[PDB]
Design a protein. Structure first.
Lengths: 125, 125, 370
């Protein structure tokens, strides 16, 4: 993989967690980057994403207030700050990278996005 | 995440019709462009047909254009290849397929993601 | 008002040609410039002469690649096409635009051989190659500003203001318009190939290695016509894959699905002009389509679909399942009605065939608020 995650773990219902996803090589400089999530049984669903410029970002409806994503000025690395975490947020968060930005991410089928990460578990007690 | 099964081949006479079917078992059908290719014992592979995800666009090798037609039903998970005005040169094993791709460069070739077992079609003189 | 012709292209270039030995700029001899570097069979470099602290741009091309490309362009009277870089074209395109249409490309200063007509050149270069004496052809231009990609990165540590976006999209359409008018296509529009200045958003086009003439007096590539007509290309691999137009993809698939591995070779001996039709697109409409993608890319802050091929892109197929209409499209519905309308007239083929660039430059949206 060229997407390499970190920051997963267990948190109390209410507390916070924050995930990195770095991408080595100045190849994804034009690609957008973001986060999906998967729970046992559930299909992988969109969480958040940010433009190549790191200037524009959008969120799923269900996290629209709690989570915010950001992107380093120099390295192709993104950060998903998660607050007010609920039991319904327990899932494996998958970092993704693509040339398309926007709600195309809700429509493109899974195997279509340019690049995927391996995953990191988040559990919420 | 898809396995394919052909059916509905046989040996016909010249000018005869035949309608190949193909059951798609696995992931959602909507999420893969389909195709049909043929393999005649003597020669190398012949790409015969490709159809888009929903069915809008379809393309054909000039050796079957306006004799054969590729269609699909996404509620019943099937691809068809209606083959009419059959000729001897259409004797071959025909293979249902999934996820055709190529590069804009002409030197490349048509790679499928999946292909079922195949069905024989022989055609009298 | 002279438009791009291959006779003129060559004549333009010969005026700019010299041995690198004998070239001075300001007082500084060529040999004594410190060239800083900027896959690619060509190498680009920056440099800074001190008399006038003047910053130049240098493209260098192996004469082996030159000599081959010139023989072909001569065979096809300027109508040679490849998926990769046509250096002979870029040279003439640049020389011509400089002499007759300042202000589209950065200023062009010289073409140089480094260790009467372009044939006399090739003669020499060929004798040199026959003695394993390699060298380069050097294209020396003004260094102008910084590309759009860079511009955006720098400014943006929001994206760029809609106000700003609009100024860039406008000047770009101006450039294409003036380029087309001069008699040339681009066929590699993308943020990296458009330069911008600090001085009042003043822009230029860059590259011209994928360029074609826009007019021809030959039918496809064979029969001599009595008057000019639009130019058609059989090379669907143009610019970056993201900007490739749908009709070019249709051609790609046509070659693939009939097992045609070398177009240039296959067509060489096809006279029946009914066949030929199937492997050709209009170049000028292709340009327009690219500019369309550029617009969407600049507005969206990134592509929406990744290639314009419904076989290989579910998103594109939805674009089409709504007749390439940004207003009826799901991913652009809540964009400015007027902008969507503007873009539609660079994308859909009926519009591309009909709607002129001069008329799009006066489109209602260029005068709305914000
Ligand atoms: N005269 C110029 N002034 C400033 N920047 C330039 C100039 N010419 C080219 N560039 C930039 O330098 C890089 C390489 O130049 P070009 O080869 O002309 O363009 P290009 O389309 O990037 O082509 P290649 O073939 O990929 S190097 C690009 O980022 C251009 O934007």
């Amino acid at each position: 993989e060229q997407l390499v995650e970190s920051g997963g773990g267990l948190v109390q219902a209410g507390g916070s967690l924050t995930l990195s996803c770095a991408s080595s090589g100045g190849t994804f400089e034009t690609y957008a980057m973001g986060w999906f999530r998967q729970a046992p049984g559930k299909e992988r669903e969109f969480a958040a994403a940010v433009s190549w410029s790191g200037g524009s970002a959008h969120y799923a409806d269900s996290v629209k207030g709690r989570f915010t994503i950001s992107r380093d000025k120099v390295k192709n690395t993104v950060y998903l700050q998660m607050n007010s975490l609920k039991p319904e947020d327990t899932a494996v968060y998958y970092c993704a990278a693509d040339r398309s930005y926007g709600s195309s991410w809700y429509h493109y089928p899974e195997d279509a996005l340019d690049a995927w990460g391996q995953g990191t578990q988040v559990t919420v007690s | 995440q898809v396995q394919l099964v052909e059916s509905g081949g046989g040996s016909v006479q010249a000018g005869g019709s035949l309608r190949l079917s193909c059951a798609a078992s696995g992931r959602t059908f909507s999420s893969y462009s389909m195709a049909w290719f043929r393999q005649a014992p003597g020669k190398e592979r012949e790409n015969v047909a490709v159809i888009s995800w929903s069915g809008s666009t379809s393309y054909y090798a000039e050796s079957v254009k306006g004799r054969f037609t590729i269609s699909r039903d996404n509620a019943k998970n099937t691809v068809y290849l209606q083959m009419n005005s059959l000729k001897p040169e259409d004797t071959a094993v025909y293979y249902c397929a999934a996820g055709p791709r190529t590069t804009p460069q002409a030197m490349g070739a048509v790679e499928y993601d999946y292909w079922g077992q195949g069905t024989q079609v022989t055609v009298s003189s | 008002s002279y438009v791009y012709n291959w006779e003129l292209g060559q004549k333009s270039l010969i005026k700019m040609l010299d041995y690198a030995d004998n070239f001075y700029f300001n007082g500084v001899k060529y040999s004594d410039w410190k060239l800083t570097s900027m896959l690619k069979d060509h190498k680009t470099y920056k440099s800074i002469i001190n008399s006038k602290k003047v910053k130049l741009f240098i493209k260098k091309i192996p004469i082996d690649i030159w000599v081959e490309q010139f023989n072909l362009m001569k065979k096809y009277e300027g109508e040679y096409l490849i998926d990769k870089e046509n250096y002979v074209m870029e040279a003439v395109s640049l020389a011509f635009l400089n002499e007759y249409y300042p202000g589209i490309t950065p200023k062009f200063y010289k073409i140089l051989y480094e260790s009467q007509d372009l044939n006399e050149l090739n003669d020499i270069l060929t004798k040199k190659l026959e003695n394993n004496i390699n060298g380069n052809i050097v294209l020396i231009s003004e260094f102008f500003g910084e590309n759009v990609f860079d511009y955006i990165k720098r400014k943006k540590n929001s994206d760029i203001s809609n106000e700003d976006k609009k100024k860039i999209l406008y000047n770009s359409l101006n450039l294409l318009m003036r380029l087309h008018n001069a008699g040339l296509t681009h066929l590699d529009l993308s943020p990296d190939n458009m330069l911008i200045s600090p001085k009042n958003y003043e822009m230029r086009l860059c590259d011209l290695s994928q360029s074609t003439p826009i007019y021809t007096n030959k039918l496809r590539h064979k029969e001599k016509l009595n008057s000019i007509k639009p130019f058609e290309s059989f090379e669907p691999c143009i610019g970056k894959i993201e900007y490739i137009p749908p009709e070019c993809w249709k051609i790609v698939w046509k070659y693939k699905m009939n097992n045609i591995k070398n177009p240039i070779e296959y067509l060489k001996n096809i006279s029946n002009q009914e066949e030929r039709k199937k492997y050709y697109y209009d170049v000028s409409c292709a340009d327009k389509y690219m500019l369309g993608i550029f617009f969407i890319w600049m507005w969206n802050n990134g592509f929406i679909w990744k290639c314009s091929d419904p076989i290989q892109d579910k998103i594109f197929e939805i674009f089409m399942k709504s007749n390439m209409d940004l207003n009826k499209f799901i991913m652009t519905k809540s964009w400015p009605h007027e902008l969507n309308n503007l873009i539609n007239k660079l994308l859909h083929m009926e519009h591309r065939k009909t709607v002129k660039l001069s008329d799009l430059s006066r489109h209602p949206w260029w005068s709305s608020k914000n």
